[PDB]
Amino acid sequence: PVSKKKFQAAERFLPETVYKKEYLADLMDCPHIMRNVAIAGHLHHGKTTFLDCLMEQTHPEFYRAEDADARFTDILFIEKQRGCSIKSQPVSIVAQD
Amino acid sequence: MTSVGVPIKILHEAEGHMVTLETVTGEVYRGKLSEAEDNMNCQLAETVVTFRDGRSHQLDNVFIRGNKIRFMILPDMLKNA
Amino acid sequence: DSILEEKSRKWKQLQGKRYSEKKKFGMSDTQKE
Amino acid sequence: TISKNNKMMAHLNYRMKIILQDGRTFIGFFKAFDKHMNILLAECEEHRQIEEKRILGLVLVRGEHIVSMTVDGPPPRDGGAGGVGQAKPGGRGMPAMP
Amino acid sequence: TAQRFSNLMAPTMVLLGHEGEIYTGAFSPDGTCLATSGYDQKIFFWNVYGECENFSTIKGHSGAVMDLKFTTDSSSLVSCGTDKSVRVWDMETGTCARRFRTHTDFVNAVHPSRRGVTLVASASDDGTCRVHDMRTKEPVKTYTNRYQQTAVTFNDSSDQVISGGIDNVLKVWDMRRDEITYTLTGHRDTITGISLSPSGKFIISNSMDCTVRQWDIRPFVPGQRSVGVFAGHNHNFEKNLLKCSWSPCERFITAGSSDRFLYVWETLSKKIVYKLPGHMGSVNCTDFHPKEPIMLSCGSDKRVFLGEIDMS
Amino acid sequence: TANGLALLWAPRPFNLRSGRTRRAVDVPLVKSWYREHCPAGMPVKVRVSYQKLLKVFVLNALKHRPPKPQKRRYLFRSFKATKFFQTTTLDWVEAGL
Amino acid sequence: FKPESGPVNHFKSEQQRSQKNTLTGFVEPAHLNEFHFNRQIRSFDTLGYAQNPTAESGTTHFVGDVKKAEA
Amino acid sequence: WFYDHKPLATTRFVNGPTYRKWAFSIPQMSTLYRLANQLLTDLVDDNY
RNA sequence: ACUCUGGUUCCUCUGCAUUUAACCGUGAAAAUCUUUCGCCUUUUACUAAAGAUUUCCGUGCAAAGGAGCAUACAUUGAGUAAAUUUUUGGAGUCCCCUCGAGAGAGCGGGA
Numbered sequence: 001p002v003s004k005k006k007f008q009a010a011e012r013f014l015p016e017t018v019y020k021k022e023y024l025a026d027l028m029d030c031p032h033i034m035r036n037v038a039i040a041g042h043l044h045h046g047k048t049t050f051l052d053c054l055m056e057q058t059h060p061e062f063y064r065a066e067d068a069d070a071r072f073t074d075i076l077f078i079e080k081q082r083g084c085s086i087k088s089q090p091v092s093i094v095a096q097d
Numbered sequence: 098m099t100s101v102g103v104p105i106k107i108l109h110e111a112e113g114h115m116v117t118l119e120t121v122t123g124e125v126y127r128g129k130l131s132e133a134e135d136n137m138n139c140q141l142a143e144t145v146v147t148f149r150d151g152r153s154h155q156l157d158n159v160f161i162r163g164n165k166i167r168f169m170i171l172p173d174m175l176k177n178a
Numbered sequence: 179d180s181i182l183e184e185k186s187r188k189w190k191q192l193q194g195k196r197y198s199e200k201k202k203f204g205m206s207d208t209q210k211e
Numbered sequence: 212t213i214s215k216n217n218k219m220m221a222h223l224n225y226r227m228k229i230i231l232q233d234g235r236t237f238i239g240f241f242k243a244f245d246k247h248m249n250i251l252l253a254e255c256e257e258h259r260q261i262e263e264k265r266i267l268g269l270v271l272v273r274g275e276h277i278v279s280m281t282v283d284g285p286p287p288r289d290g291g292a293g294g295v296g297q298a299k300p301g302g303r304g305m306p307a308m309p
Numbered sequence: 310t311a312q313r314f315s316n317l318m319a320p321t322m323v324l325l326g327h328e329g330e331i332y333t334g335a336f337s338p339d340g341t342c343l344a345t346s347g348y349d350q351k352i353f354f355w356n357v358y359g360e361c362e363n364f365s366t367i368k369g370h371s372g373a374v375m376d377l378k379f380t381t382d383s384s385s386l387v388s389c390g391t392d393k394s395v396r397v398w399d400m401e402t403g404t405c406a407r408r409f410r411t412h413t414d415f416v417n418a419v420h421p422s423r424r425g426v427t428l429v430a431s432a433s434d435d436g437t438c439r440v441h442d443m444r445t446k447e448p449v450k451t452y453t454n455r456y457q458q459t460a461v462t463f464n465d466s467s468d469q470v471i472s473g474g475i476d477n478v479l480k481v482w483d484m485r486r487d488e489i490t491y492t493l494t495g496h497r498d499t500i501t502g503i504s505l506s507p508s509g510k511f512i513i514s515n516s517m518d519c520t521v522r523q524w525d526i527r528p529f530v531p532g533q534r535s536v537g538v539f540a541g542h543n544h545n546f547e548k549n550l551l552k553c554s555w556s557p558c559e560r561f562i563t564a565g566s567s568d569r570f571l572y573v574w575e576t577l578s579k580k581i582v583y584k585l586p587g588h589m590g591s592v593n594c595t596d597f598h599p600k601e602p603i604m605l606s607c608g609s610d611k612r613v614f615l616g617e618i619d620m621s
Numbered sequence: 622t623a624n625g626l627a628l629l630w631a632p633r634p635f636n637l638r639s640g641r642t643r644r645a646v647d648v649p650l651v652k653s654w655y656r657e658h659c660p661a662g663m664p665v666k667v668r669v670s671y672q673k674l675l676k677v678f679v680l681n682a683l684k685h686r687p688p689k690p691q692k693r694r695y696l697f698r699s700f701k702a703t704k705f706f707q708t709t710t711l712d713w714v715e716a717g718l
Numbered sequence: 719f720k721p722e723s724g725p726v727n728h729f730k731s732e733q734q735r736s737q738k739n740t741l742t743g744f745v746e747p748a749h750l751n752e753f754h755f756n757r758q759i760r761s762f763d764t765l766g767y768a769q770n771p772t773a774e775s776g777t778t779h780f781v782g783d784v785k786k787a788e789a
Numbered sequence: 790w791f792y793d794h795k796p797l798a799t800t801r802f803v804n805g806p807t808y809r810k811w812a813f814s815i816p817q818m819s820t821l822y823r824l825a826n827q828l829l830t831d832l833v834d835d836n837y
Numbered sequence: 838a839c840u841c842u843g844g845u846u847c848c849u850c851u852g853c854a855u856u857u858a859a860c861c862g863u864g865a866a867a868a869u870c871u872u873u874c875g876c877c878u879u880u881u882a883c884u885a886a887a888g889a890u891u892u893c894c895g896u897g898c899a900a901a902g903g904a905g906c907a908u909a910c911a912u913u914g915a916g917u918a919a920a921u922u923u924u925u926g927g928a929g930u931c932c933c934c935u936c937g938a939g940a941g942a943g944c945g946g947g948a
């Protein structure tokens with residue numbers, strides 16, 4: 001019955017963040033602040049590991065191994081195994097200038 | 098930046114939003130705080146000025162010298178910040 | 179009162195030895211030297 | 212009170228009544244201050260002498276204009292580990308007697 | 310079917326989790342909780358009702374705990390132990406609000422003031438009876454006796470401190486005089502515990518001579534203060550400081566006993582009517598729940614018993 | 622500095638400088654040799670032996686199963702706890718004999 | 719506690735009438751202050767007397783060469 | 790110290806006689822790296 | 838202003854090491870059940886692969902207690918210590934008109 005269909009990581013809870021979720025959801029009402037961005041690269045340039053640094057700063061609980069990239073935005077298990085990114089994934093975070 | 102006090106930090110988070118500030122001469126300015134400074138100079142845009150007699154007028158931009166501002170009503174989401 | 183002096187002495191030894199730090203709970207995992 | 216760190220952290224979040232040099236009375240939950248004695252009042256209201264009450268938002272008062280402030284009301288308000296023992300129901304075994 | 314008398318889940322409960330010999334146990338005055346401790350040094354809190362789960366446990370003691378009493382408002386638990394220290398535990402935080410440390414030898418017995426400023430009477434193997442105050446490092450009063458003191462209580466007005474000890478006779482000190490106002494004489498061996506009546510008129514005192522003696526501590530009595538003597542319990546060669554306690558209606562008195570039996574006496578007749586087996590060793594402490602007819606007993610058998618009775 | 626930079630791409634363990642310590646039975650001194658490839662010149666016997674050692678390594682890695690979390694059965698501590706066993710320091714040829 | 723009413727046998731006198739559970743005796747678990755129990759062995763062995771272990775010991779507080787206990 | 794039985798165990802480079810952790814410098818690490826050479830691979834491995 | 842503790846090392850106990858892409862182990866054994874090839878006048882012991890389960894050699898961290906070696910009170914968790922334009926060194930007082938018994942307010946006027 002408990003079919004092991006799992007093909008992607010999905011988090012069992014909301015992880016901790018430095019910002020309150022309420023301040024994120026309130027800032028959503030204010031496009032005079034918010035920005036949208038895409039990060040685009042040749043294969044295996046910085047792009048995914050750089051977002052892991054933005055994750056590590058906002059989250060505190062975000063474990064990065066000393067040996068290998070965590071690659072949080074590479075959620076699929078094919079992307080974990082291949083380690084190239086294969087599909088886009090979005091992040092939303094509050095961050096200070 | 099250097100560690101300026103929390104009220105000045107909250108003032109810069111108020112830059113996105115509408116703020117309402119009263120000047121020492123009594124006029125109330127409501128507008129969208131486009132720049133603020135650590136001396137709390139304020140630049141407002143899309144401004145409405147309300148005079149002490151209750152008349153009002155629109156103003157496209159206003160610069161208020163920081164030491165002439167009595168108080169500002171900030172938006173509530175900044176309480177979360 | 180001299181009997182109370184003796185009883186005071188007896189009580190001091192008994193409670194001293196009973197509670198003694200060498201005998202408190204959580205002790206004598208004794209190392210096989 | 213303020214600046215004495217053990218004391219200052221407890222005087223924040225009190226509901227405080229602020230008197231300004233124009234004679235206004237503001238009331239709100241005082242929850243930030245600055246070396247220039249600027250103060251930030253959450254959920255603020257004003258009382259103007261004539262008394263009339265008006266509701267404001269989060270109000271930043273530039274410190275230059277404060278005369279004085281006083282406590283109006285308390286901050287809002289709302290071991291834990293064990294589990295070693297167990298407590299099943301039972302009964303009393305009768306011992307021996309002489 | 311059978312008669313029931315309390316909200317207990319069963320007419321007796323066996324509480325297991327201790328490993329040390331349990332030397333003391335008391336209910337919270339609100340009736341929600343009880344706390345128990347002894348040679349394990351860990352103070353175990355238990356709920357009175359339902360599964361009675363051990364919701365909290367406080368460490369921090371490093372010498373075994375002689376005696377343990379709640380403050381009247383139930384905000385704090387006061388406990389003392391052979392670490393020469395008196396420790397006051399905040400009930401909400403579970404942390405040591407005060408650690409009085411001026412005793413020079415084992416502290417065996419503790420009693421908080423009933424009302425006014427929170428004061429803690431304490432008695433010790435250094436022979437001093439000391440009253441501490443939450444507000445000061447130094448104690449308010451130190452009364453020194455030549456012989457070790459192992460029981461203490463205030464009176465209800467919290468202005469006389471009654472301390473008993475090796476002397477068998479009782480040094481009762483009046484806190485405005487700093488003198489013994491009177492002594493209570495009848496005990497042939499050391500006094501293992503004293504408990505003040507709910508109304509404050511009387512105290513019971515338990516002693517190693519295997520009797521509990523009831524004393525009238527009211528300001529005027531026209532003759533001898535000995536009201537009565539209770540017997541039937543026993544003190545064994547362990548020489549424990551077996552405690553005693555009052556029923557909140559005063560009609561019943563209890564004392565610890567080395568014969569494993571939970572004794573209850575009727576105050577006027579001094580007869581026994583409850584002799585409750587179930588323990589496997591010396592019953593060091595016994596107390597009544599303050600609102601409901603539940604008996605607590607703590608024993609050297611590492612077990613705590615809760616049970617309900619027909620208090621008549 | 623020149624040596625420190627060279628260590629960064631030394632083979633493991635030499636790219637570390639701080640490490641947990643490992644049992645002498647676990648250091649498999651020759652294992653990198655059979656992993657990498659046969660040298661072009663080595664004859665029949667040795668080439669076949671490289672394939673057989675890869676087969677053993679590939680079956681070991683394929684089957685694996687991660688270790689169970691358990692209470693470790695310390696058994697020599699259980700002997701040492703009883704009165705019947707004593708401990709002493711001995712010379713390996715004495716202990717062997 | 720109230721005692722069983724009526725006569726008691728002449729058939730089965732002072733050993734056999736007593737309370738028992740195992741074949742000779744009432745056996746029940748006990749816990750004590752180990753250290754004090756250790757003390758009471760050592761006094762009986764070295765000195766000839768001990769403080770009476772029994773529950774409900776009554777007046778018989780001590781058990782041994784009572785002349786030594788009093789002296 | 791190279792041929793001691795448990796080398797360095799009584800020194801600041803390893804936690805103690807349980808011999809569970811080590812922290813060598815670079816002068817040490819480059820020297821034993823150079824001695825190990827005959828056993829080691831040449832590769833910047835992963836692509837090969 | 839408060840309770841709170843000596844370093845280091847070692848022993849033993851207790852808890853957790855299931856979200857496995859993957860890994861408590863940069864190493865790598867054995868057994869059982871079920872299933873599929875090859876030896877055999879018989880069974881074990883076997884060949885070599887899969888799946889499900891165990892055992893065994895190890896492992897990590899945290900906490901607790903104790904025991905040993907050289908010895909020191911600070912300090913952890915809980916909290917202190919600048920008069921020249923934008924705040925913390927007075928552009929402040931007084932004297933008229935208005936509403937109102939009263940005392941304040943009007944981008945009020947003026948010395």
Ligand SMILES: Nc1nc2c(ncn2[C@@H]2O[C@H](COP(=O)(O)OP(=O)(O)OP(=O)(O)O)[C@@H](O)[C@H]2O)c(=O)[nH]1
Binds near residue numbers: 041044047050071084
């Ligand atoms: N040397 C070095 N390598 C890095 C650095 N940052 C990332 N890399 C390596 O480059 C590889 C790819 O990193 P990723 O974050 O997956 O790069 P990527 O571009 O997101 O991969 P794709 O987006 O799929 O192309 C990994 O092996 C990283 O270790 C770096 O700062 N220095």
